[PDB]
Amino acid sequence: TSEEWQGLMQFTLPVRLCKEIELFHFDIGPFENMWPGIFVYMVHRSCGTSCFELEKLCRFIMSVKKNYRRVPYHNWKHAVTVAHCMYAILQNNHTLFTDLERKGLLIACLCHDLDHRGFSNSYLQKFDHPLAALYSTSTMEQHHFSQTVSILQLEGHNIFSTLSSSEYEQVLEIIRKAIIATDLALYFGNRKQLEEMYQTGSLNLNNQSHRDRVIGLMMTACDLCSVTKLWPVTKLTANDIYAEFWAEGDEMKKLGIQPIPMMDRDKKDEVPQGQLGFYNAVAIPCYTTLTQILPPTEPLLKACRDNLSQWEKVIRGE
Amino acid sequence: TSEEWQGLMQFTLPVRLCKEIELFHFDIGPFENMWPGIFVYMVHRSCGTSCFELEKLCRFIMSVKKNYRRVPYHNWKHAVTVAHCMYAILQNNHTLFTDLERKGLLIACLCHDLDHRGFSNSYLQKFDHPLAALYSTSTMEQHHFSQTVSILQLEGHNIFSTLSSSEYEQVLEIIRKAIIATDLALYFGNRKQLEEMYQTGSLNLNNQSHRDRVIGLMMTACDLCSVTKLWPVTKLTANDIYAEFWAEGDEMKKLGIQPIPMMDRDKKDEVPQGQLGFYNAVAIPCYTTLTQILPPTEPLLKACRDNLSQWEKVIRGE
Amino acid sequence: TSEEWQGLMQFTLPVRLCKEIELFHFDIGPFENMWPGIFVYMVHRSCGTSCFELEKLCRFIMSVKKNYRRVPYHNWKHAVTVAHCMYAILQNNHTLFTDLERKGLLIACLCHDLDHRGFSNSYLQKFDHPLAALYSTSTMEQHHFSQTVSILQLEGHNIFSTLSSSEYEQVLEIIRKAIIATDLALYFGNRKQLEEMYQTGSLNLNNQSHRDRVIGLMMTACDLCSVTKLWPVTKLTANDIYAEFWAEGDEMKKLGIQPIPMMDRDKKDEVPQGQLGFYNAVAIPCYTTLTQILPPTEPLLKACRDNLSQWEKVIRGE
Ligand SMILES: C[C@H](O)C1CCN(c2nccnc2Oc2ccc(Nc3nc4ccccc4s3)cc2)CC1
Ligand SMILES: C[C@H](O)C1CCN(c2nccnc2Oc2ccc(Nc3nc4ccccc4s3)cc2)CC1
Ligand SMILES: C[C@H](O)C1CCN(c2nccnc2Oc2ccc(Nc3nc4ccccc4s3)cc2)CC1
Ligand SMILES: [Zn+2]
Ligand SMILES: [Zn+2]
Ligand SMILES: [Zn+2]
Ligand SMILES: [Zn+2]
Ligand SMILES: [Zn+2]
Ligand SMILES: [Zn+2]
């Protein structure tokens, strides 16, 4: 049968990639046509060779790729990078997650920024974009999930077709919650609740609501993972991020609204201090809380701390 | 019937867009997939819901879009922007124009730079491009009109199919003259004639030759309308214009010809003075004459004057 | 018949292009859709109007174009430029080459960088790319030839279909050797052997192994021909080359490897001295040896010397 042939086969990568893909700070490289294979490899190792039908999975991946836009940061490369960070978390916390969760989270990460224009929720609201009229909160994130469902509804694209309806509904809910959690506006309240539950010892992974929160923080950790790469990667990625932000700032100016210094290209000299404030307020607390809950995710925090030190070095002019 | 269903329907935009689209200094935004709807909205309001068959119009618009190139300035965004300026002129001078003229001028504006490579007529002549051998004068503009006719000749693309042959020939002549008028080389003689006719009182909109001249000036006013936007928009658009000019200057250097300082990237520091000279010699007289002939177009002149003041501020280093 | 209609026809270019295409320092221009016609013109003049079936040749050219990537330097424009340099060599040494060689070399030049990603053989080895596992030496070049054969194998794409199998095998070997020779790592040993054979007088174009070496040097000369253009062209092309090199340097840094100063964007100030060293060590000896073997190729050396003088002028700050 088809599933019998797939069970005998094993998908493989080049030697360097096979070894280094297990590291949290792995970079997927500049060869775009290798990314689909990298994702399939990660799915096969974290879930199994029988989790998805290979022909359907490949069809799904290519359609997801087609629905990411040619923008500096929120692009196809970001999607696969976020998926890799989730893979590394999953592999280092392997006993904790169900088959459905491992299936759902990797797919959620791949789809989490689908059809991103490179503009924030704030900008879409101020422009009065039709999406803002449809989705009052988490505007882009609700759209990302809508795009995901639409791709799944295409003929030959339902990668969850072998699942029961019950399991199908469960995995789609996992995906929905995970994608919505990537709205950074929701992260601050989530992390604060998680910190309190951890300190009191009330935090329980057997409680679904608690489990959803931890998954939410995992999604934030994967989404921001550029700060957990080695310095050369982190610094170069920052160029892509600001390219998008400054473009939005330009568009804000076109609306007759003065943008925040973060999005203002006239204030390039304040970037090192701006990054310092981001690491202190957002990045460090995120990976600190995640390391407390899931100790094997420690390398993410260490790398984040190392990059914080690098930004301090830039400020001093060293 | 089909026209009966279209009569009952009404096309609408978001609240902010509906209000601000009436302003001369309106910016169409960075969301490309909203531009077709913006154009249809303008056609529906200025001409009527029964002017074009909606399915044919949408098919036409998408083909026009496909025939604009990925260049910094002379692109799809420019086409819709020029069309909007015409819409604002039409709406503020509503009693003056026939149904054919309102139909023709919006379409002429949308099509006026079709298949633009980002090079001037001068460059094509010096390169010895096949287009220069076919069209001795107004090389690109004659090509733009040829592209327009070719798109109209495609199956299901004749948006003027319900018109009589007489009316069809009239609208195509309106379109031809309007597009040819966007050759800035022809503007100087046109404006000079219009100024004389206005001052003597011989200018008569009931005279076809006079009417053609006024339409010609309207086309120039719409074409140069980036100088009538608010300062942030005007300044950012200037970056796109010079990107094209400097690229042409590079190509001129490749032919062994020293380009004019306007097209020379080595003379970036002279841009503010170069803009000052352009406003004084071309932009201000254009909108002054247009305001004299059509007083409701006054906001274009005011905004042009405001931008002239801004460039003077740049020169002083303020 | 079809070949009879083709014999009566003659393909022509604009006046300036017809005259200046014969010069070694000719630039093909910024009009992409003119390049296919330029190539066909060169084939018709150097080989003949009966060398290729026009419909098949055009189909081949467009497929080759489709298989070049949107990279700053190793792109479709480079391919046609390299082909032109070969045309100029062929036309100025017309009595030396067979019909098969003239056919093969122009096609080899057009196909010599097929599917180039903008990365060196060194980078692919260090990244551990699948291509490096398949091709241990001349990694990209062996791939370029593989792409060439694949395009030829497509239905209606065999431009050599009228040739006997014997002649077909001969032309494919000419193409293979020519493309492999564009590996600059192989140039140094080739030029050294050619210099020795020329000085002793053992060099004999009637000897196939010697002939292969001369063709190899011709390929190097055509590949590096940007240094033989006029200064404005040479200087602007250098921007495209470094764009690719610095991108590779960035990727090297992402692997945790410090790139050589050539590929390091942090060392932009050393470019003029870096170019000086390249002209002295690689470019000048290449065209000197080629001029010794084929004296009509002298204009390439003169132009290379002129550009060397220009780089020296940059260093002095003049
Ligand atoms: C919007 C998305 O969810 C993500 C949001 C966070 N993100 C970033 N990741 C790593 C580094 N930087 C990221 O975005 C920024 C987050 C914060 C800043 N902060 C500031 N930057 C500046 C720069 C100049 C002047 C003031 C400021 S304040 C700048 C960029 C990636 C995109
Ligand atoms: C060719 C098209 O019909 C249009 C021509 C006019 N156009 C412009 N609109 C707004 C602002 N600038 C436009 O183009 C220019 C028109 C004039 C100049 N003038 C000069 N600019 C410089 C810059 C440096 C040194 C000397 C000079 S002279 C520069 C640009 C948009 C394109
Ligand atoms: C890889 C391909 O076969 C070709 C290799 C040679 N090539 C060039 N042609 C003309 C000019 N430059 C070319 O590539 C270079 C060849 C040598 C250098 N040399 C150096 N450049 C620098 C710059 C800064 C610091 C040190 C150095 S050393 C730079 C670029 C075109 C591409
Ligand atoms: Zn997002
Ligand atoms: Zn994201
Ligand atoms: Zn134009
Ligand atoms: Zn225009
Ligand atoms: Zn090559
Ligand atoms: Zn090459």
Side-chain angles (χ1 to χ4, degrees):
Chain A
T1 72
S2 298
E3 59 171 14
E4 288 180 333
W5 274 95
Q6 281 192 224
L8 293 160
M9 288 188 288
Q10 52 272 128
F11 203 87
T12 183
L13 261 51
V15 176
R16 191 198 64 87
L17 279 82
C18 280
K19 188 174 171 285
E20 294 178 359
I21 200 165
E22 296 307 315
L23 304 165
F24 283 92
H25 63 268
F26 176 71
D27 182 273
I28 62 170
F31 303 102
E32 294 207 61
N33 295 330
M34 290 187 71
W35 303 337
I38 288 167
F39 186 75
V40 175
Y41 179 85
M42 289 189 298
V43 168
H44 282 208
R45 276 194 70 95
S46 61
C47 194
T49 51
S50 299
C51 284
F52 299 104
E53 202 277 304
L54 188 62
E55 192 176 306
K56 278 199 172 187
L57 181 58
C58 288
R59 197 180 289 111
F60 180 82
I61 292 160
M62 297 310 289
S63 282
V64 172
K65 173 190 171 68
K66 186 189 162 69
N67 283 283
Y68 273 90
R69 296 178 186 244
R70 299 186 189 104
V71 288
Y73 179 73
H74 287 96
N75 51 41
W76 180 230
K77 191 172 191 178
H78 174 67
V80 184
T81 298
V82 169
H84 167 265
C85 191
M86 181 58 70
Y87 167 80
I89 294 173
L90 259 34
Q91 292 299 262
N92 288 285
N93 300 275
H94 204 253
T95 64
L96 306 190
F97 306 97
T98 62
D99 282 315
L100 288 172
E101 286 169 339
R102 292 197 290 252
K103 280 175 194 179
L105 290 175
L106 289 175
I107 295 299
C109 286
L110 197 76
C111 296
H112 89 279
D113 269 333
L114 270 168
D115 198 35
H116 205 289
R117 292 106 160 109
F119 299 107
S120 71
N121 288 335
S122 180
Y123 177 73
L124 268 76
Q125 195 278 330
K126 290 172 189 296
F127 190 82
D128 203 8
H129 196 278
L131 285 168
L134 191 70
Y135 310 120
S136 62
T137 60
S138 303
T139 302
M140 283 306 300
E141 293 74 27
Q142 292 199 62
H143 180 66
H144 302 316
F145 177 69
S146 187
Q147 290 284 304
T148 307
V149 177
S150 293
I151 292 169
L152 285 163
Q153 286 173 155
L154 298 166
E155 188 184 21
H157 285 72
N158 187 12
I159 52 169
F160 304 116
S161 66
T162 57
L163 270 43
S164 69
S165 175
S166 180
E167 290 176 326
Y168 182 88
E169 294 300 310
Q170 286 172 234
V171 75
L172 264 289
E173 271 296 293
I174 290 162
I175 290 163
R176 191 192 58 82
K177 288 173 189 169
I179 292 175
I180 298 302
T182 64
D183 182 6
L184 197 65
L186 301 174
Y187 149 80
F188 299 98
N190 189 48
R191 194 215 65 85
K192 199 169 186 287
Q193 290 298 311
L194 281 166
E195 187 66 39
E196 180 69 27
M197 291 179 298
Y198 169 80
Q199 291 297 328
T200 56
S202 64
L203 188 62
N204 192 341
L205 290 170
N206 302 281
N207 180 305
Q208 191 62 47
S209 67
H210 291 211
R211 196 173 185 89
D212 291 346
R213 288 196 178 274
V214 177
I215 287 168
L217 185 67
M218 284 164 56
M219 288 302 290
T220 306
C222 293
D223 202 18
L224 303 174
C225 78
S226 83
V227 306
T228 63
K229 304 299 174 190
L230 298 188
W231 180 238
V233 180
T234 299
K235 186 64 171 73
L236 286 163
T237 306
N239 296 340
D240 299 331
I241 302 160
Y242 280 103
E244 287 201 1
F245 285 170
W246 296 331
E248 186 176 320
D250 291 349
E251 292 302 323
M252 285 287 282
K253 289 177 187 179
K254 292 182 189 179
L255 287 174
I257 312 159
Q258 177 63 44
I260 54 164
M262 187 180 82
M263 295 181 183
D264 201 338
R265 65 171 74 256
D266 296 331
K267 291 168 181 175
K268 277 180 179 67
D269 66 328
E270 294 170 31
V271 161
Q273 274 288 329
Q275 284 294 307
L276 175 74
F278 175 73
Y279 276 74
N280 291 327
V282 186
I284 292 289
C286 176
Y287 298 106
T288 304
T289 305
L290 187 76
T291 303
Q292 285 173 339
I293 302 166
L294 309 170
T297 67
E298 172 79 295
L300 294 168
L301 179 62
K302 186 193 171 290
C304 185
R305 285 169 174 175
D306 287 333
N307 282 318
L308 172 59
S309 299
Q310 290 292 311
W311 282 113
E312 289 176 342
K313 191 192 174 74
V314 180
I315 297 158
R316 295 192 297 270
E318 192 185 326
Chain B
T1 72
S2 298
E3 59 171 14
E4 288 180 333
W5 274 95
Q6 281 192 224
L8 293 160
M9 288 188 288
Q10 52 272 128
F11 203 87
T12 183
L13 261 51
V15 176
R16 191 198 64 87
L17 279 82
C18 280
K19 188 174 171 285
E20 294 178 359
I21 200 165
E22 296 307 315
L23 304 165
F24 283 92
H25 63 268
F26 176 71
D27 182 273
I28 62 170
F31 303 102
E32 294 207 61
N33 295 330
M34 290 187 71
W35 303 337
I38 288 167
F39 186 75
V40 175
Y41 179 85
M42 289 189 298
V43 168
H44 282 208
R45 276 194 70 95
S46 61
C47 194
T49 51
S50 299
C51 284
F52 299 104
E53 202 277 304
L54 188 62
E55 192 176 306
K56 278 199 172 187
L57 181 58
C58 288
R59 197 180 289 111
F60 180 82
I61 292 160
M62 297 310 289
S63 282
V64 172
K65 173 190 171 68
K66 186 189 162 69
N67 283 283
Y68 273 90
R69 296 178 186 244
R70 299 186 189 104
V71 288
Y73 179 73
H74 287 96
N75 51 41
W76 180 230
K77 191 172 191 178
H78 174 67
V80 184
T81 298
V82 169
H84 167 265
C85 191
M86 181 58 70
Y87 167 80
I89 294 173
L90 259 34
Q91 292 299 262
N92 288 285
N93 300 275
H94 204 253
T95 64
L96 306 190
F97 306 97
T98 62
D99 282 315
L100 288 172
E101 286 169 339
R102 292 197 290 252
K103 280 175 194 179
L105 290 175
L106 289 175
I107 295 299
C109 286
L110 197 76
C111 296
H112 89 279
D113 269 333
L114 270 168
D115 198 35
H116 205 289
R117 292 106 160 109
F119 299 107
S120 71
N121 288 335
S122 180
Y123 177 73
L124 268 76
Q125 195 278 330
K126 290 172 189 296
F127 190 82
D128 203 8
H129 196 278
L131 285 168
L134 191 70
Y135 310 120
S136 62
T137 60
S138 303
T139 302
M140 283 306 300
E141 293 74 27
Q142 292 199 62
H143 180 66
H144 302 316
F145 177 69
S146 187
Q147 290 284 304
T148 307
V149 177
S150 293
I151 292 169
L152 285 163
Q153 286 173 155
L154 298 166
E155 188 184 21
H157 285 72
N158 187 12
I159 52 169
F160 304 116
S161 66
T162 57
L163 270 43
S164 69
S165 175
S166 180
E167 290 176 326
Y168 182 88
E169 294 300 310
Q170 286 172 234
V171 75
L172 264 289
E173 271 296 293
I174 290 162
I175 290 163
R176 191 192 58 82
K177 288 173 189 169
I179 292 175
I180 298 302
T182 64
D183 182 6
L184 197 65
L186 301 174
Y187 149 80
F188 299 98
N190 189 48
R191 194 215 65 85
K192 199 169 186 287
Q193 290 298 311
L194 281 166
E195 187 66 39
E196 180 69 27
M197 291 179 298
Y198 169 80
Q199 291 297 328
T200 56
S202 64
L203 188 62
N204 192 341
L205 290 170
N206 302 281
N207 180 305
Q208 191 62 47
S209 67
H210 291 211
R211 196 173 185 89
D212 291 346
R213 288 196 178 274
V214 177
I215 287 168
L217 185 67
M218 284 164 56
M219 288 302 290
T220 306
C222 293
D223 202 18
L224 303 174
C225 78
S226 83
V227 306
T228 63
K229 304 299 174 190
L230 298 188
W231 180 238
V233 180
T234 299
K235 186 64 171 73
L236 286 163
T237 306
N239 296 340
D240 299 331
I241 302 160
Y242 280 103
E244 287 201 1
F245 285 170
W246 296 331
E248 186 176 320
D250 291 349
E251 292 302 323
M252 285 287 282
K253 289 177 187 179
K254 292 182 189 179
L255 287 174
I257 312 159
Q258 177 63 44
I260 54 164
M262 187 180 82
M263 295 181 183
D264 201 338
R265 65 171 74 256
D266 296 331
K267 291 168 181 175
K268 277 180 179 67
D269 66 328
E270 294 170 31
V271 161
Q273 274 288 329
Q275 284 294 307
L276 175 74
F278 175 73
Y279 276 74
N280 291 327
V282 186
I284 292 289
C286 176
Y287 298 106
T288 304
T289 305
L290 187 76
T291 303
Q292 285 173 339
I293 302 166
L294 309 170
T297 67
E298 172 79 295
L300 294 168
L301 179 62
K302 186 193 171 290
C304 185
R305 285 169 174 175
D306 287 333
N307 282 318
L308 172 59
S309 299
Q310 290 292 311
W311 282 113
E312 289 176 342
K313 191 192 174 74
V314 180
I315 297 158
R316 295 192 297 270
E318 192 185 326
Chain C
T1 72
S2 298
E3 59 171 14
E4 288 180 333
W5 274 95
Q6 281 192 224
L8 293 160
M9 288 188 288
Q10 52 272 128
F11 203 87
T12 183
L13 261 51
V15 176
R16 191 198 64 87
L17 279 82
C18 280
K19 188 174 171 285
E20 294 178 359
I21 200 165
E22 296 307 315
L23 304 165
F24 283 92
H25 63 268
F26 176 71
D27 182 273
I28 62 170
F31 303 102
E32 294 207 61
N33 295 330
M34 290 187 71
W35 303 337
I38 288 167
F39 186 75
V40 175
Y41 179 85
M42 289 189 298
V43 168
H44 282 208
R45 276 194 70 95
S46 61
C47 194
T49 51
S50 299
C51 284
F52 299 104
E53 202 277 304
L54 188 62
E55 192 176 306
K56 278 199 172 187
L57 181 58
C58 288
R59 197 180 289 111
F60 180 82
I61 292 160
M62 297 310 289
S63 282
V64 172
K65 173 190 171 68
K66 186 189 162 69
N67 283 283
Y68 273 90
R69 296 178 186 244
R70 299 186 189 104
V71 288
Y73 179 73
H74 287 96
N75 51 41
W76 180 230
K77 191 172 191 178
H78 174 67
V80 184
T81 298
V82 169
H84 167 265
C85 191
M86 181 58 70
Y87 167 80
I89 294 173
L90 259 34
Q91 292 299 262
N92 288 285
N93 300 275
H94 204 253
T95 64
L96 306 190
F97 306 97
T98 62
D99 282 315
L100 288 172
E101 286 169 339
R102 292 197 290 252
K103 280 175 194 179
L105 290 175
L106 289 175
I107 295 299
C109 286
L110 197 76
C111 296
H112 89 279
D113 269 333
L114 270 168
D115 198 35
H116 205 289
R117 292 106 160 109
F119 299 107
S120 71
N121 288 335
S122 180
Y123 177 73
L124 268 76
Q125 195 278 330
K126 290 172 189 296
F127 190 82
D128 203 8
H129 196 278
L131 285 168
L134 191 70
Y135 310 120
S136 62
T137 60
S138 303
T139 302
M140 283 306 300
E141 293 74 27
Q142 292 199 62
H143 180 66
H144 302 316
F145 177 69
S146 187
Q147 290 284 304
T148 307
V149 177
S150 293
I151 292 169
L152 285 163
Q153 286 173 155
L154 298 166
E155 188 184 21
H157 285 72
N158 187 12
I159 52 169
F160 304 116
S161 66
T162 57
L163 270 43
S164 69
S165 175
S166 180
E167 290 176 326
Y168 182 88
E169 294 300 310
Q170 286 172 234
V171 75
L172 264 289
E173 271 296 293
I174 290 162
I175 290 163
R176 191 192 58 82
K177 288 173 189 169
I179 292 175
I180 298 302
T182 64
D183 182 6
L184 197 65
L186 301 174
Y187 149 80
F188 299 98
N190 189 48
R191 194 215 65 85
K192 199 169 186 287
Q193 290 298 311
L194 281 166
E195 187 66 39
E196 180 69 27
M197 291 179 298
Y198 169 80
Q199 291 297 328
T200 56
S202 64
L203 188 62
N204 192 341
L205 290 170
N206 302 281
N207 180 305
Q208 191 62 47
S209 67
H210 291 211
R211 196 173 185 89
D212 291 346
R213 288 196 178 274
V214 177
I215 287 168
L217 185 67
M218 284 164 56
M219 288 302 290
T220 306
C222 293
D223 202 18
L224 303 174
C225 78
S226 83
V227 306
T228 63
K229 304 299 174 190
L230 298 188
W231 180 238
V233 180
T234 299
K235 186 64 171 73
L236 286 163
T237 306
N239 296 340
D240 299 331
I241 302 160
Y242 280 103
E244 287 201 1
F245 285 170
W246 296 331
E248 186 176 320
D250 291 349
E251 292 302 323
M252 285 287 282
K253 289 177 187 179
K254 292 182 189 179
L255 287 174
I257 312 159
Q258 177 63 44
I260 54 164
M262 187 180 82
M263 295 181 183
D264 201 338
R265 65 171 74 256
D266 296 331
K267 291 168 181 175
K268 277 180 179 67
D269 66 328
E270 294 170 31
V271 161
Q273 274 288 329
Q275 284 294 307
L276 175 74
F278 175 73
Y279 276 74
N280 291 327
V282 186
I284 292 289
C286 176
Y287 298 106
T288 304
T289 305
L290 187 76
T291 303
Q292 285 173 339
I293 302 166
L294 309 170
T297 67
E298 172 79 295
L300 294 168
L301 179 62
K302 186 193 171 290
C304 185
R305 285 169 174 175
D306 287 333
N307 282 318
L308 172 59
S309 299
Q310 290 292 311
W311 282 113
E312 289 176 342
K313 191 192 174 74
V314 180
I315 297 158
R316 295 192 297 270
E318 192 185 326

